[model samples]
Target chain A: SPRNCLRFTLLGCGSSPGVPRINGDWGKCDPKNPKNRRRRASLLVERYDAEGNNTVVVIDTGPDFRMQMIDSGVHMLDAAVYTHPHADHIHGIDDLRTYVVDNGRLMDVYANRLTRNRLYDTFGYCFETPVGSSYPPILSMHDIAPETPFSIEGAGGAIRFEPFSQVHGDIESLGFRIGSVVYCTDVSAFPEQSLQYIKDADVLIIGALQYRPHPSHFSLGEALEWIEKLSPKRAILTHMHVPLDYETVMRETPHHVEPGYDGLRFEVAV
Target chain B: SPRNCLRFTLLGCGSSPGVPRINGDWGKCDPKNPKNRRRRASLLVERYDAEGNNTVVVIDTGPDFRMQMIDSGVHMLDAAVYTHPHADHIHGIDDLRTYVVDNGRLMDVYANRLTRNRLYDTFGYCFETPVGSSYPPILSMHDIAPETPFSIEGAGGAIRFEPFSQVHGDIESLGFRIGSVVYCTDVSAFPEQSLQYIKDADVLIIGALQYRPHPSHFSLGEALEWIEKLSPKRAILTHMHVPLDYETVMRETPHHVEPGYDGLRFEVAV
Candidate 1:
């Protein structure tokens, strides 16, 4: 079964800075709940083949990438798949230099055309021609379109993942599948065809930014309803605001599934 | 000799990150031209004595603290003197933990009552009751009043300085003096009596945030006139906006002065 083995890790699970602007409360999110204390909402997926070598692919380097990377002790990055170019998700991109700064290697970033445009706009240095012929932080950009599945070459082999359109409040979003786990952070609603792409996922990592209602982020109830509809093997809610205290949520929530903290890793099968 | 030795070190000399905002060019802030670009306005003051030990004090930890700190190669900070609680000026404060985090020492901070009250309101964790219970990086707060001179323990030993008031458009700003070096970054106008305190210093490190003028910051002409009145041995402008490129100001200006860039260090003798 190692050929089909897969895993997902939570890099940051908070909404924004995760603690919310107010500090003490994050809306309906319980403060005492440990799982509720979200980071910046990131996930890492690993694919294992019977051949022995395992490969890790990261999804979105959220603002908490530094702390998340430290907590997980994952130093080397195989690739970075950007979900969007928003500051919260992409602000931590600079920290990626620890991996390639010395070697002068470009980080491989796969994203949709829109995301790529935004990324280049947000980070002009990455795309600018080498000044004085001195190499800049190496970043290889591969832009993808919607509804297309892409293959990312890994140390062991390659992993195929399909993307589907999602609606995060009003802004367009994207969702992806890696073996059994599908991550849909920063989303409010799914498009018609998204369900097909996420069909029967063993693990569904969804964004539930709040317990009540939100404009661009998912409410806990809405997320739960979606989880029930899709009926995955297990559903882990994430993207909590600061009010979602980690310890309190662990004490109150029922088992079988849970919300993620800064660093929570788990394995699965395809 | 004492009057001639006052020097001003330009710590950070830029506007907010991506200062031109939208549609504005970064202008001609070439690495080649020291004046064309800015780093956000932070300054370092050196207290000199007969012996070698000189103390370094800093003002306003701008968003560029990491690079600026490294640029100046400042080894120690006796205290931080704050102007206001704006995000651009104070956001880099967290980085102070890098030096003060595990020391179990208290960092001295001098601020006006308004600034102190606002600092407490914004960063409650820093002033937590259990002392070091929070990630406060441990600092002592001193309520500084205009016209009151205080002695601070510096690397050189002990130095006395006076705090005077300045009008930053509408906000109340502070200016400090050690020996003959007078640092008045971020000024709109000198209250009629302020000149009595600032007149004829070796170096007047004033804030010339723009050229056309600003409500809260000084224009280049205004700053230059003030410098003329002060008639210091030399004048170095700081807290610059993007429009006044460092090099352009250097070329078009009259006076024994230059637009400051990051990493430029100066020493003063008293």
Candidate 2:
């Protein structure tokens, strides 16, 4: 029971352009609310054993990864996991070079086949063996299988992640069930198998892009329906577009449904 | 004289990792100093004609491009120029998609041969014609020749940029002489031809990475020497590493040389 307990930090919950966007276009969101200000989508998880040993894992190093890390006060990292290979989700891969340099070891990166191929294609330089160069980073890639389990071990207790594939328009995104918490983002629809995996989660963090429909992302109504179907003890909405204001979503969502914000933290204890 | 006048905003002047880095590694920088807080290297320039028509150009959009654009209050962009193709410099290329979507036109991108090759290799998707997709950004590519001149025109007016090649370690970076202001970054040594182009500029914005020698960037002393050699009326040091504190650099350098910070503004009316 102690081994399964985990701490989760929602490092960033904003959609691709992020809240306020490039020119401070907040859409229908209130500009005065600090909570409405968000970064790209990312999550940080930490697992600790009784012996004071802990492992920190970051899910989806988005474009805002550098600021998220600094603002969250995270110095060291044990590993990084990916949901997909979109620019907003993986462009910050270069920032992890600092961790590899400081820790004096190759960083472990986990993703599916397409994600791995894209990472190698876009950021292949980081995988090369060259230290002391301007961007000397080395990463060990691991392939994750959809609907299968993978375990990452550290000094702290290991966390088992059950990954399932979710439909995201033209592509598929990996949704993970770690402990009793399920994280699914950039999901337009869920296949039956993935839906089964995510059924009845203790905590669920899902993407709700807007009130209207999107080809690859869930609308607010769609996300709420999925949340109700799964009936997670707590449903936290993320990957919100400007149309989904913090206060507005909170007022409309169900009692257990909450809007996610940057640096939101919770304990995954069940 | 009024037609040639320009406004320059040093959107970000930080080195690769940036000041305070990803995990608050300030190095020799003072954390309390706001100027020491930096992002990846980027510069914004605006040129206006007598009729209140203006053209906005961004040079080397870094990973912090979105934040830089938002914080600097820059909305429309006529074009983007590349100094080099390092991840820190080009990672934010994805963010330009919004403009393309909003303007309903292909964004213009200019870079040297190497930079062009890298951009094509790393971010070839943008170059492809795609609309209505999540990342529906199309870009038109133009070539830049070393020691040659290229022109980008807008409704406001046209500006001629004379480009020179600078040695950046094994690779090369492009430096631009626009009007009386020459902008150069990630430069190690200047060849005789390039040095000639930089000679006696009215204002020079150059890269000075740190206090010590770097393989691809100038040390503070090297930058100062180059400033003296070029004899620019004013020299603003940019691309600074953590070691060069803002006030400390200004206090130590000549009266005309300034340590650049995020949002640092200047008039290029010579």
Candidate 3:
């Protein structure tokens, strides 16, 4: 194993509305609990190449993207991967303007057809600037196919990742597997064929909405079943609603399984 | 003053990109200053009518809308008014689904032609759901011409507001005056004719970007000049960048002028 290998930063680990819904309501969670202080769902991944230069990538750009980036001290971005086009997942697309301005080039964004089309429609200004406009195009889109592995090269080094599809209620979301870690969120069901992409992962990060079942997301029971089936060394439950308090989740789940929180990080080897 | 009149809440008070620009950089702001912890710029107005029912309205649903609402305990929204269609001000528009879902009715949204057209293009799904989609149209758009005084009636009572235009670099932003309170942000220069709407305001909320002038936004000096010329009983400077610290601003500005912070509230007569 090399020093300063791949790492994961759980930028935010909250459901669509996040814990403590807009009325200062904390649901079943304790207001004094720091873990209950969720923003929105997002993740940051980085790796130190053989030369030890940092290569960073982010999954999802929720409403909390600005704060998450600041909290993580991520001044640079190598690539951005999208899971879906839900507002909580893609609304912060414009915040990428900083990196584009800093690097004086377009930022690379990876997404499937659905998410790509939605991004182009909702945030077209980021892709192409209008003629005689101050808001210049700052991002270039790239298509990533499910089940197909793709490699992105940067000055620091290269990173290879695989994309998988998951059923997220009415819409579909893309899941990613980079090195020994698999990240799946906002998922209700997973196809058997997709299991190949996430099988026997060292770290599995999945969404567990609450105790009961939801139409579009995995319940605590369903998430636990997946964890047991995959049996990874570490299984982290994320995208929590206010009902799933952190201490309660820790008390109930298995030793290897625990609730995820903002700024939580895990290290792995590629 | 009438009983149960109107009031204001400053939901967020940060500039376009907000403070701590994603790299742990606080610029000129002190890291330990809680007052320096700013979100994006937004405002909320609410009142209790003659019947004592709560009526709420919001100006600019920035990315921090969720957390802002949570912090302010704004559970319901009667209407939403847009300042402009800039990313920071409009990206959180989708979160309005909760209101639509709870009310089972179309949310009321008001804007001018430019902003209305831009919202339609960017958030088409929110205005009209696609075929075979569960997502239904959640909002109804109302057009308000610049320089026009409009009134919206609701079960709580009625709200009368005036709209005026201001220059924001290459684009334009609409400013609003409700009763004796005026809300204006992201503005560079105000039109001479528009000054009538803001004149003699009891409370003036305006954007003051930083110490230095920019092409698009008013600096602290310019904002102070406007404050002096407008001659409001109280002037609140908002939409500040990290370069402006709260304590420093308070110490340097006139007693009538102060920097705005999140969750700051004041009262007014409707």
Candidate 4:
């Protein structure tokens, strides 16, 4: 069971602009509360072998990616995955260039067709070599279809994931199920077929944008319904906007539901 | 004389990956020294009128733009300018949208043709209004040419700039002369005509990447040569890489030549 478990880290849990925003507008968040401070939403899954060798895989390198990696001491990245191609989620793609220096290999990245195309169009340098420069492509993109199962390998071991499609307003996002844990961010609604991947998850980490409905993200009440429907053993709310203060969310939510903060850590499928 | 001057802030002074880089590699920097910590290179000019009204204008919104604005307590931005089209200087362009919310008007930006084209290509949303979404363009980019003079109006009155061209490796960048102060970053070589704009400045903020010569930036020694050539009253070095440590550079340089750090503030054109 220990071997099957992976350490999960919520590197950032703030919504798009993050709590406090750029101009220090905290909105409903309490300035004195450290938990109210947040960065963009990102996920880190760390697997360790018997030799204490760590394999780090990340999901969604957002704009705060550099600071998050430094704060987490993540020097070695095994692979990366993307949930969607929003600016807050993917602007840090260029910073991934550093992780490839030591290994002398391109970082393996998996994404859906839409996200891959956006990544290519926005940051093509990561995938294509520049003319007259010796710098190699930093990332190798792999396609992952919705409702498909894929496995990524590293020093620690191979980890399996089941990815499903979700609706993010006018766009499509991704939700993943790994072991008994489910991660669904930026999802305004889920497809009926996608319920197969999220049913009765042991630990669910999902986005809850604000108290009210938004075009691209789940409101607090909407996320609560998902928690009630899935009845996850432990559910952590993430990708929070300023409206959802930590103390308020914690006090209001059910006992199993906890508001996720940046740098929050837990174990999955244990 | 003080009334005629404006306060200048060095928002960020780190090279591409930044000091204590993503992996906490403080390469050649003394880890214990705080001044060695840097963000991406960005400059801020603040003008205050006789009535104590403040107006802020920034050059180059790097990826660190959000954090820099928060750290510096910048709420309202008057205008912005760009020096180059590099990723380190322009990816933070999206965050400009937030500043426009309070003003109820688009933020005015000035850039050379090369940077504007790249900004349009990479982050076209800031310029072109999306087809369906009624969201207005956050920025209104005005064209600036090399060796040309332009003035911007704000609460602090009109501020004038003399822009000149600089060669950065294979690419081109812009250098600006405002009043008696000169700001130049990411420049490998300066054109002959540019010397007329930089001569005998009171304060000069220039880019110095590392110890060795770089293709796109001046080495510390090379920057020293520029200071000697221009003979500014005071010179500050920025856009530093790992090899250049704060304490080391301080000990190595003359009294007037200082290495810049994030959040550093001073006045220019006094």
Top DockQ model: 4
Q: Which window of ten consecutive residues has the lowest lDDT sum in model 4 chain A?
A: A128-137
TM-scores for all candidates: the values are 0.52, 0.95, 0.93, 0.96
lDDT tens per residue, model 3, B114-224:
899989998888899875468778899999877988876665677888999999998989999998999989999999989998889899999999999898899999999
What are the runs in model 1 whose C-alpha is more than 4 Å off? Answer: A1-4, A20-36, A49-52, A102-104, A129-137, A246-255, B1-270
DockQ of every predicted complex:
0.03, 0.52, 0.61, 0.62
Instruction: Let me know the DockQ for model 1.
Output: 0.03
In terms of docking quality, how is candidate 2 classified? medium
DockQ for model 3 equals: 0.61
The deviation in Å at residue A68 for candidate 2 is 0.6
Task: Show model 4 residue runs off by greater than 4 Å.
Answer: A1-4, A130-135, B1-4, B130-135
Give all candidates' CA lDDT scores.
0.67, 0.86, 0.86, 0.87
Model 3 RMSD to the real structure? 2.6
Clashing pairs in 3: A22-B70
What is the lDDT, from 0 to 100, of the residue B217 in candidate 4? Answer: 91
lDDT of 4 by residue, B13-65 (tens): 99999998888899999989888998998988877777656778899998889
**Taking the tens digit of each residue's C-alpha lDDT, what string does model 2 give over B59-131?**
9878899999999876778889999889889998888877877667898999988889888877878886333
lDDT of 1 at B207: 80
The 10 consecutive residues of candidate 4 chain B with the worst lDDT sum are B128-137
Better of 2 and 3 by DockQ: 3
Candidate 4 structure lDDT: 0.87
